[PDB]
Amino acid sequence: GCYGGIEIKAHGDAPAAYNISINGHMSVEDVRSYNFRHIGHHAATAPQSVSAKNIVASNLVSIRPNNKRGFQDNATPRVLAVSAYYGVVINGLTGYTDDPNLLTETVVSVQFRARNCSLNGVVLTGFSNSENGIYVIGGSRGGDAVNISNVTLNNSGRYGVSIGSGIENVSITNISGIGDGINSPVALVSTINSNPEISGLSSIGYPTVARVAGTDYNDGLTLFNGAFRASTTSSGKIHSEGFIMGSTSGCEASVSKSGVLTSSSSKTSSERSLIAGSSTSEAKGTYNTILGSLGAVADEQFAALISASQSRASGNHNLILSSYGINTTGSYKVNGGFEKINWELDSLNGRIKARDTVTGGNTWS
Amino acid sequence: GCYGGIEIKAHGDAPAAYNISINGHMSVEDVRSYNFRHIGHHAATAPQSVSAKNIVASNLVSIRPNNKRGFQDNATPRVLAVSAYYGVVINGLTGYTDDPNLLTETVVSVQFRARNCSLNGVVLTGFSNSENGIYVIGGSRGGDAVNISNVTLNNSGRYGVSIGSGIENVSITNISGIGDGINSPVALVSTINSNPEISGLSSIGYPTVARVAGTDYNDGLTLFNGAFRASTTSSGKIHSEGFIMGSTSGCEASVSKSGVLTSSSSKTSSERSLIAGSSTSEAKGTYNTILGSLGAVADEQFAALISASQSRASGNHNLILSSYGINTTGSYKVNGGFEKINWELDSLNGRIKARDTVTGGNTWS
C-alpha cells in the first residue's frame, strides 16, 4: 500500500544508490513495486548519472499494482520501472493482477537513460487492459544492450514486448504470450529498429506475432546480427555483411555482400559474390560467382566459373564452364577449354567459335 | 522424509494455489522434492486449470529423493514434478543422490498440461539408473513453450533431456552430460517433434548425443525455426521457409523455399529460388536462379540468369549468360547478347544460332 515497494535512487544533486542486491521481495498493492531511478539524469539532454550502477534483483513478486490512493499526483502503476541505472540484472519476476483496470499503461518499463539491463524469467499475468507488457526505450549509447529472455505473458499487454527508439543492441529470446483475453491486442513483439536479435517466439490471440520495423512475422522468426558463421570450425575474416557456412579451414568472406558455402581454402573479397562447392578458389572482382570448382579465380566484374579447374576468368561478364587450365580475358564471353581456350560464345558481337569443328547433323551414339 | 517437500496445488473442485515464490529450499529424502499440480486438470480431455499460474522457484536443493517409506502407494520419486501449471520459472536447481536405485523413472518431469515452463541452471548428479533426466510432454496448445538451458547431467538419465509428444515449441540450449557411469545410456538429448530449437550440446559416454525425430547427431547441432536472417541489418518480408544472408537493405524472400544471399535491393517471390551476388534483381517465377547479376529479372518457370545485366529471362527453362540488355522468351534455350540477342543454344530443337558468324579453326591469340 505504498508508492514504491522498493525504491532505489537519488534526488538531483546527490549520488544514486549503487551496488544494491534484492534477494527476494513481495510487493502487495504498491504503485510501482520496484522503482529504480536517478532524478536529474533521465532527460536525453541531461548528463548520464556517474553513480547509478549495479542492481541485481531476483525472485521479485508484484501483486495488484495500482494507484487507488493517488500517490505522486496519480503516477501510473508499474510492476517494474527502471531509469538512469547502468547494469540492472533481473531474474525471476512474477507480476500478477486480478483487476485489468488498475494498471493501464506499461507493466515493466526500461527507459530514461537506463542502459545495459537484463531481464530473464518473467511471468506477467492479468494485465489485459495495459498498452505494453514490457516497454524499452534507449539512450542511444555506445556499448549499450538490453537482454530480454524467457518471458511469458498471460493476457498482459496489447504490445507484449515493445522496443522503442534509441536502441541498437537488443536480444529478445523465448517470449511467449496469450492474447485471447486482451482488450484489442496488437503484437506479441514489436520493434522500431530494423536489426533486433530475436528467436523463440510463441503466441496465441495476438493478430501479429512479431512486428519488426513495420514488417510482420507470424510464422516464426530467427534474426542474428554481425558476421555469421555456421558448421565451420575455423575461418579467416568474415565481414559483418558476409558469411561462411558448411566449410573447412582457410576460407574468408572479407567484404560487404560476400559469402562462402561448402568449400575449402577459398576466399572472396568480391563485393556481391558467392563461392560454393569449391576448393582453393578466389573471387576478387565484383558480382563474382564460383561454383563446384578447384583452383578457380574470378578477378573482374561479373566474371564467373562453374565446374572449372585451375582456371581464371578475368573478363568483364566473362563466364568459364566445364574447363581445365584456361585463362580468359574477353568481354561478354562464355568460354570453355582444356589447357587452351577451345570454344567461345561471344555475346558482345554474336560470334560462336570452336578451335576444331562446328557441325550440325550430330547424334550421341 | 515427507512425500512432497514443497507441494503447490489444489484438489479437484478447488482453485489451485497461484503466484507463489520459492526463494531457496532444501529438500532431504522426500519422495517428490518439489511437486506442483492441480488434480482434475491433468488429463488431455479435462478442462485446463484457470487458476494454476505463476510459480517462480529458485536455488532449489533436492537430496536423495526416494520412496523407502511407501508414501502415496509407492509413487515414483522426483527431484521436480510439474503438472497443470502455466508459467513456472525454475532457476538454479541441484539434485543430488548417492544411491542410483532410489529413483529409477524420471528425475524432472514437466507433463500433464503443464505449459510455458522454463528451466535454467540445473545440475543433476548421481541418478545413474533412471530412465530420464528431464522428461517433457506437451498438451498440445497454441502459445505454449518449454525452455531448457544451462543444464549439466552427471551420470543422470539414460535419456538426459527427453521431449515427448504434443510439444511444438521447444528451446534446448547448452546441455552437457557425462554418461560413462550410467546403466545403458541412450542419448543426451532426444526429441519426438522434428523441429526443436537446439544448440550447445556436449557429452561423453552417451552413444548418441542428439536424437531428433529418429535422426542422430553426434558431432554438434544448431537448429533454428522460422524465417531466418543473418549478417543483414534490414530487409523486407522473409517467409518462414526462406532466408536472407550477407545482404544490404531492400531484399525479400517472400515465399516457401526462396532465398537471397550476398545481394542488394533484390527480391524473390519465386517458389524454389535463389538470388546470390546480385543487385536490383527479381525472381518471380518458380525454379529461378539469379547469380552475379545487376537489374536481372527471371519471371518464368526454370528461367535463370548468370553474369547478366539489365536483362530478363522469360522463357520456360530459359537461361541467360554473360549478357547486357536482352529480353528472352524461348523455351529450353540458353541465350546471350548485348542490347539484342546475339547467340542461342536451342535444347528443344538442337539448333545453334549466332547473329554474326559460326566458325571452327579458331585460336585465341
If you write DSSP's letter for every residue of B195-247 in order, what string do you get?
--EEEEEEEES-SEEEEETTEEE-S---B--SEEEES-S--S-B-TTEEEES-
Resolution in angstroms, to 1 decimal, for this deposition? Answer: 2.1
Inter-chain CB proximity A289 and B294 less than 8 Å = no
- Backbone φ and ψ for B270, nearest 5 degrees, come out as -105, 120
CA atoms lying within 13 Å on the CB side of residue A291 = 13
Distance from CA of A49 to the nearest CA of B (A): 31
Q: Is B147 in contact with A200 (CB distance < 8 Å)?
A: yes
Distant-in-sequence, close-in-space partners of A214: CB < 8 Å, separation ≥ 6: none
Distance from CA of B102 to the nearest CA of A (A): 31
DSSP state of A131: S
* Measured distance CA(A324)–CA(A341) in Å, rounded: 9
Q: Which residues pair with A190 in a beta bridge?
A: A162, A211
Work out whether strand A333-337 and strand A341-346 pair parallel, antiparallel, or are unpaired. Answer: antiparallel
Joined together, the cell numbers standing for residue A153 give 505473458
Q: Is A208 in contact with A187 (CB distance < 8 Å)?
A: yes
What is the separation of C-alpha B164 from the centre of its chain, rounded to a whole number of angstroms?
15
DSSP SS3 for A25: strand
Inter-chain CB proximity B116 and A152 less than 8 Å = yes
* Measured distance CA(B104)–CA(B362) in Å, rounded: 81
Q: Is A181 in contact with A206 (CB distance < 8 Å)?
A: no
Distance from CA of A189 to the nearest CA of B (A): 13
Q: Which residues of B touch A273 (CB under 8 A)?
A: 262, 277, 292
Cα distances (angstroms) measured from residue B176 to each of A227, B81, B97, B152: 27, 21, 18, 5
DSSP state of A342: E
Length of chain B: 365
> What CATH number is attached to the domain comprising B305?
2.160.10.20
Rounded (5°) CA angle B146-A195-A206: 45
Nearest to B206 by CA among B195, B219, B222: B219
Cα distances (angstroms) measured from residue B103 to each of A273, A315, B5, B95, B178: 57, 72, 16, 11, 18
Distance from CA of A313 to the nearest CA of B (A): 12
Work out the end-to-end distance of chain A between its first and last CA atoms, rounded to an integer number of angstroms: 94
* CB-based contact, A78 to chain B, within 8 Å: no
- Which residues of chain B from 289 to 308 reach within 8 Å of chain A, CB to CB? 291-294, 306-308
* CB-based contact, A351 to chain B, within 8 Å: yes
Residue B307 is nearest to which of A215, A274, A317, comparing CB atoms?
A317
Cα distances (angstroms) measured from residue A256 to each of A31, B113, B142, B282: 50, 48, 40, 20
Distant-in-sequence, close-in-space partners of A257: CB < 8 Å, separation ≥ 6: A241, A242, A271, A272, A273, B246, B247, B248, B262, B263, B264, B277
Beta strands of A86-204 (E only): which ranges? 86-96, 106-111, 115-125, 132-136, 146-154, 159-163, 170-178, 187-191, 197-204
Q: Closest chain A residue to B326 measured between Cα atoms?
A: A347
* Measured distance CA(A176)–CA(A119) in Å, rounded: 14
Distant-in-sequence, close-in-space partners of A344: CB < 8 Å, separation ≥ 6: A330, A333, A334, A335, A351, A352, A353, B362, B364
Rounded (5°) CA angle A174-A113-A59: 45
Inter-chain CB proximity B355 and A356 less than 8 Å = no
Q: Which residues of B touch A24 (CB under 8 A)?
A: 21, 23
* Measured distance CA(B311)–CA(B298) in Å, rounded: 9
DSSP state of B72: H
Joined together, the cell numbers standing for residue A331 give 568481354
* Measured distance CA(A25)–CA(A79) in Å, rounded: 12
Q: How many beta-carbon contacts under 8 Å exist across A and B?
A: 306
Q: Which residue segment(s) compose the domain that B272 sits in?
A: 226-365
Inter-chain CB proximity B357 and A345 less than 8 Å = no
H, E, C per residue of B261-278: ECCECCEECCEEEEEECC
Q: How was this structure determined?
A: X-ray
Residue of B21, B262, B278 to mutate, testing the A interface (most A Cβ within 10 Å of its Cβ): B262
- Backbone φ and ψ for B72, nearest 5 degrees, come out as 55, 50
If one counts every other C-beta atom within 10 angstroms of the C-beta of residue A63, the result is 19
Nearest to B57 by CA among B84, B28, B33, B31: B33
Work out whether strand A319-324 and strand A304-313 pair parallel, antiparallel, or are unpaired. Answer: parallel
Q: Which residues of B touch A340 (CB under 8 A)?
A: 364
* Measured distance CA(A96)–CA(B280) in Å, rounded: 51
Q: Which residues of A touch B279 (CB under 8 A)?
A: 272, 287
What is the separation of C-alpha A74 from the centre of its chain, rounded to a whole number of angstroms?
38
DSSP state of A240: T
- Which residues of chain A from 123 to 162 reach within 8 Å of chain B, CB to CB? 123, 125, 150, 152, 154
Q: Which amino acid is at B19?
A: N
- Which residues of chain B from 157 to 216 reach within 8 Å of chain A, CB to CB? 169, 171, 197
DSSP SS3 for A246: coil
If one counts every other C-beta atom within 10 angstroms of the C-beta of residue B317, the result is 18
* Measured distance CA(A78)–CA(A66) in Å, rounded: 8
Residue of A59, A118, A170, A344 to mutate, testing the B interface (most B Cβ within 10 Å of its Cβ): A59
Residue of B233, B279, B333, B364 to mutate, testing the A interface (most A Cβ within 10 Å of its Cβ): B364
Q: Closest chain B residue to A352 measured between Cα atoms?
A: B358
Q: Which residues pair with B252 in a beta bridge?
A: B267
Q: Which residues of A touch B116 (CB under 8 A)?
A: 123, 152, 176
DSSP state of B47: P
Grid look-up 510501482 returns A32
Joined together, the cell numbers standing for residue B157 give 538419465
If one counts every other C-beta atom within 10 angstroms of the C-beta of residue B15, the result is 12
Q: Closest chain B residue to A218 measured between Cα atoms?
A: B240
Rounded (5°) CA angle A314-A319-A325: 65
Q: Closest chain B residue to A335 measured between Cα atoms?
A: B322
Instruction: Report the C-alpha dihedral over residues B268, B270, B275, B279, rounded to 10 degrees.
Output: -40
* Measured distance CA(B207)–CA(A70) in Å, rounded: 64
Grid look-up 531511478 returns A37
If one counts every other C-beta atom within 10 angstroms of the C-beta of residue B41, the result is 21
Distant-in-sequence, close-in-space partners of A311: CB < 8 Å, separation ≥ 6: A293, A295, A296, A297, A305, A320, A323, A324, A325, A326, A327, A328
Residue B19 is nearest to which of A94, A253, A358, comparing CB atoms?
A94
Distance from CA of A193 to the nearest CA of B (A): 9
Work out whether strand A215-217 and strand A208-212 pair parallel, antiparallel, or are unpaired. Answer: antiparallel
- Backbone φ and ψ for A73, nearest 5 degrees, come out as 55, 50
Distant-in-sequence, close-in-space partners of B31: CB < 8 Å, separation ≥ 6: B2, B3, B4, B65, B66, B67, B69, B71, B72, B75, B77, B78
Instruction: Report the C-alpha dihedral over residues A299, A305, A309, A314, rounded to 10 degrees.
Output: -30
